[PDB]
Amino acid sequence: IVGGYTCGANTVPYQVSLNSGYHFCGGSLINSQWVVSAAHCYKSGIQVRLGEDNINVVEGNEQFISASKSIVHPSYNSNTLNNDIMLIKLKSAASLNSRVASISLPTSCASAGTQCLISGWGNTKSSGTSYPDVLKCLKAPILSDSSCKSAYPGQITSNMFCAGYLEGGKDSCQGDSGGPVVCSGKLQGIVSWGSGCAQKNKPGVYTKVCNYVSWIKQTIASN
Ligand SMILES: [Ca+2]
Ligand SMILES: [Cl-]
Ligand code: NA
Numbered sequence: 495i496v497g498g499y500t501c502g503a504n505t506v507p508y509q510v511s512l513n514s515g516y517h518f519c520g521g522s523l524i525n526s527q528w529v530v531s532a533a534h535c536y537k538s539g540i541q542v543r544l545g546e547d548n549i550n551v552v553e554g555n556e557q558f559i560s561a562s563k564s565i566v567h568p569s570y571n572s573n574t575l576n577n578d579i580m581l582i583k584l585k586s587a588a589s590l591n592s593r594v595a596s597i598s599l600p601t602s603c604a605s606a607g608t609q610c611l612i613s614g615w616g617n618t619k620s621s622g623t624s625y626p627d628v629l630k631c632l633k634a635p636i637l638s639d640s641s642c643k644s645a646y647p648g649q650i651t652s653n654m655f656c657a658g659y660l661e662g663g664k665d666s667c668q669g670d671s672g673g674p675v676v677c678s679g680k681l682q683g684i685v686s687w688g689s690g691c692a693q694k695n696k697p698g699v700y701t702k703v704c705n706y707v708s709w710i711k712q713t714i715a716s717n
């Protein structure tokens with residue numbers, strides 16, 4: 495997250511860190527046994543880290559649970575990042591409390607202008623590199639379809655939306671991938687991609703989660 499603020503310990507209790515020896519991607523807890531992340535985060539040897547603020551310090555609210563199975567979206571295209579969504583089942587149910595809590599799936603798509611909370615442990619620089627160890631937050635509005643398509647000609651599908659600021663300075667960045675965009679208490683986005691970070695006229699592109707609710711619910715019901 496570039497141009498965000500320090501969330502505060504466990505203030506985003508649905509935020510997970512995907513660990514394969516190190517934080518590599520965000521995720522969103524959606525019930526005691528399932529995480530939603532970006533398909534482009536897929537790899538084996540995933541350990542889901544819940545209750546995290548400092549990812550380098552054991553602070554006392556962590557639950558570390560190995561992934562038992564990953565399900566990349568059937569129609570995920572790694573070249574276009576169309577359908578950049580994946581589900582991870584935990585080997586055991588997370589113990590749910592004030593600091594480790596599921597985020598509600600949307601019943602409806604969010605609209606341009608709606609303010610959302612974007613969070614993750616990604617790069618905090620637009621030029622050069624600095625990884626924070628504590629969770630960073632950004633309040634960003636969803637952008638119009640037409641703005642999003644103008645910003646990225648030929649690249650925005652019906653499964654993508656832009657959130658952020660065309661003036662730049664405030665964005666998601668490398669290491670935020672797979673993390674949440676929460677708009678009035680609902681998971682509407684997954685940190686998917688962008689052109690660099692916090693560049694003018696290159697806002698963050700997010701997986702449109704409302705498109706995937708029937709897939710998520712069916713997958714969970716049979717896995
Ligand atoms: Ca920690
Ligand atoms: Cl539009
Ligand atoms: Na379960």
